[PDB]
Design a protein around this ligand. Structure first.
Ligand code: HEM
Ligand SMILES: *[C@@H]1O[C@H](CO)[C@@H](O)[C@H](O)[C@H]1NC(C)=O
Ligand SMILES: *[C@@H]1O[C@H](CO)[C@@H](O)[C@H](O)[C@H]1NC(C)=O
Ligand SMILES: *[C@@H]1O[C@H](CO)[C@@H](O)[C@H](O)[C@H]1NC(C)=O
Ligand SMILES: [Ca+2]
Length: 595
């Protein structure tokens, strides 16, 4: 409206047009508009941003500024009164493995990352934010309510820094603030390879023409690879236990070591690249470093898209899968592939799927050692428990044999995340992911629950009695309206997650609509979609159709007993078969005959 196109981060890219490979940045995917879907650009706005000043000031900033004539509730008070629970008994999903949760976070990390304004390296008003809880500029502290236990142990607030935005830092007053997506909008293994040139090259082994990703030179896993350490200090993975001095992993995505099961699936994905490369080199000995890397990178990209679109999305979206992600009818270069700002909140439905513990299992799928089961809060920024406690295999069997948390209207987010979250720089296991989510919704200028209901063609309840019938829950509706006063003011993260789940799904109608739309767009708007004619030969696709997470495990660990359907709740031994019974990835169609 104001500027036709704002852009002062980086301008310079020529598009190869004849390349059979993606760029690292996601530039040049869309031939007409080559910036579309590329990293370090604004998140898309499906609806106009909603700030108290119309431009940048979040709702909740100014004590005397209402939203529609009512004060917005403190994020931590919504967390305390709606999101928390004590009893972990009976909270588990009887039909989703823990891998279902974990694949969600992997997928999320491929698609979106809104970094905190890291501009300010002098910036020691961290102290002003952390120690003194003074709201100002990029410091937007989560203030504790009266009656919060954390007030007795942790001071007045949790520190919270506003997200980075385009055009960029110390802003103007022209059109509304847009937060940055720092990774590629394409489902493209950017979490393995990186979304920028510096990092992508750092991760590569350029010491041999084999197109390998670099691997740890200090630790191994029964001959099997770990990712390189991040050697930059301070290291949060070091902070959590000095004695071990085990740093964080270096992977394509900065968040890889945030929890031990994310690091685990990252390690599996890195292993797969090197596995693929080796079999491609064995198959095509001529192929130089670059062709090996790119052909393996391109295979890993397709694996992620198939597991996500064939196995994962149908058991998230349930009855809504067909209404939003119909069967694929080819690349449409008019679709916007960019991740939307709202999607980055809709996809945090995952937060309610995280259980309170993580288990290491032995070969008989029984407890591994005397501390087999660990509280999740001890596993934030934890790589030492991988290297110095049995490696990947015990944690992968836990992923198969243990269950996700089920979303529950009276048991939303485990206290492991809601009271004990560790944030790098902030020293304590004392943060609230639910409160952060709600504060972030306001930071990003999110429209409220009823704007999104209207967007999705759903009823917009105006009364307690109206909200009760949509939530199918009188008490939850009462607690939300006591805090928010009007359903128009409910933050999209809590409103979306409050809805009962669609038949055969794990999200309610509103999230199904938002996630459905976004996943439709990243498939239909991707020139390198695995099923787009010319990306892969017909034979290559017939082979790719047979990938599975079970096969990924079989090839990249010493786990020989796996389930056929790894996202279902599977119990050992009834639901487990030998790896020999699990279809393989036939790489024979990648045979290149130069004569
Ligand atoms: C999606 C998604 C996001 C937003 C990513 C983006 O675009 O920036 C997200 C964020 C976070 C954050 C940052 C919170 C903030 O400052 O706003 C943390 C600290 C965190 C921690 C954990 N999450 Fe998460 N998360 C997203 C999605 C998912 C999903 C999706 C299905 C799962 C599962 C998941 C899990 C976890 C997790 C598990 C133990 C931790 C810790 N997240 N997330
Ligand atoms: C479990 O979920 C799958 C979909 O993942 C479904 O097809 C199957 O019927 C389910 N079994 C149970 C226990 O409902
Ligand atoms: C690079 O590859 C060679 C094997 O081909 C290996 O000896 C070396 O350690 C590798 N370096 C890294 C950091 O992966
Ligand atoms: C720290 O790591 C050491 C070395 O592995 C381990 O033995 C010890 O129990 C750990 N302590 C904590 C607090 O994690
Ligand atoms: Ca990506």
């Amino acid at each position: 409206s104001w500027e036709v196109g704002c852009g002062a981060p980086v301008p310079l890219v020529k598009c190869d047009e004849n390349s059979p490979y993606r760029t690292i940045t996601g530039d040049c995917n869309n031939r007409r508009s080559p910036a579309l879907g590329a990293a370090n650009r604004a998140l898309a706005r499906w609806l106009p941003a909603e700030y108290e000043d119309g431009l940048a000031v979040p709702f909740g900033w100014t004590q005397r500024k209402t939203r529609n004539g009512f004060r917005v509730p403190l994020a931590r008070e919504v967390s305390n009164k709606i999101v928390g629970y004590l009893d972990e008994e009976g909270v588990l999903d009887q039909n989703r493995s823990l891998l279902f949760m974990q694949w969600g976070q992997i997928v999320d990390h491929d698609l979106d990352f809104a970094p905190e304004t890291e501009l300010g390296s002098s910036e020691h008003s961290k102290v002003q934010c952390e120690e003194y809880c003074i709201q100002g500029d990029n410091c937007f502290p989560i203030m504790f309510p009266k009656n919060d236990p954390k007030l007795k142990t942790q001071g007045k607030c949790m520190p919270f820094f506003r997200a980075g935005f385009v055009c960029p830092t110390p802003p103007y007053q022209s059109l509304a603030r847009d937060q940055i997506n720092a990774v590629t909008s394409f489902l493209d293994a950017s979490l393995v390879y990186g979304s920028e040139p510096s990092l992508a090259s750092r991760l590569r082994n350029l010491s041999s023409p084999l197109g390998l990703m670099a691997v740890n030179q200090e630790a191994w896993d029964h001959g099997l690879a770990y990712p390189p350490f991040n050697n930059v200090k301070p290291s949060p993975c070091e902070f959590i236990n000095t004695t071990a001095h085990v740093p964080c992993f270096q992977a394509g995505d900065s968040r890889a070591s945030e929890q031990i099961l994310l690091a685990t699936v990252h390690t599996l994905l890195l292993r797969e690249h090197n596995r693929l490369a080796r079999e491609l080199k064995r198959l095509n000995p001529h192929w130089d470093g670059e062709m090996l890397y790119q052909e393996a990178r391109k295979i890993l990209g397709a694996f992620i898209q198939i597991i996500t679109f064939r196995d994962y999305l149908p058991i998230v979206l349930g009855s809504e899968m067909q209404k939003w992600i119909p069967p694929y009818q080819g690349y449409n270069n008019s679709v916007d592939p960019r991740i939307s700002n709202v999607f980055t909140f809709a996809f945090r439905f995952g937060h309610m799927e995280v259980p309170s513990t993580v288990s290491r299992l032995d070969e008989n799928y029984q407890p591994w050692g005397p501390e087999a089961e660990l509280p999740l809060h001890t596993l934030f920024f934890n790589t030492w428990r991988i290297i110095k406690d049995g490696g990947i295999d015990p944690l992968v069997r836990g992923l198969l044999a243990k269950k996700s948390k089920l979303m529950n209207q009276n048991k939303m987010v485990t206290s492991e995340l809601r009271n004990k979250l560790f944030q790098p720089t902030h020293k304590i296991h004392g943060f609230d992911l639910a409160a952060i989510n709600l504060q972030r919704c306001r930071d990003h200028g999110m429209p409220g629950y009823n704007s999104w209901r209207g967007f999705c063609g759903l009823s917009q309840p105006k009364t307690l009695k109206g909200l009760q019938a949509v939530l199918k829950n009188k008490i939850l509706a009462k607690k939300l309206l006591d805090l928010y006063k009007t359903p128009d003011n409910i933050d999209i993260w809590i409103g979306g997650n409050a809805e009962p789940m669609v038949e055969r799904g794990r999200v309610g109608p509103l999230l199904a609509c938002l996630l459905g739309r976004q996943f439709q767009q990243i498939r239909d708007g991707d020139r390198f979609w695995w099923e787009n004619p010319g990306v892969f030969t017909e034979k290559q696709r017939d082979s790719l159709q047979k990938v599975s997470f079970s096969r990924l495990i079989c090839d990249n660990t010493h786990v020989t007993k796996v389930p056929l359907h790894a996202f279902q709740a599977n119990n050992y031994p009834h639901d487990f078969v030998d790896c020999s019974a699990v279809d393989k990835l036939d790489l024979s169609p990648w045979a290149s005959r130069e004569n």
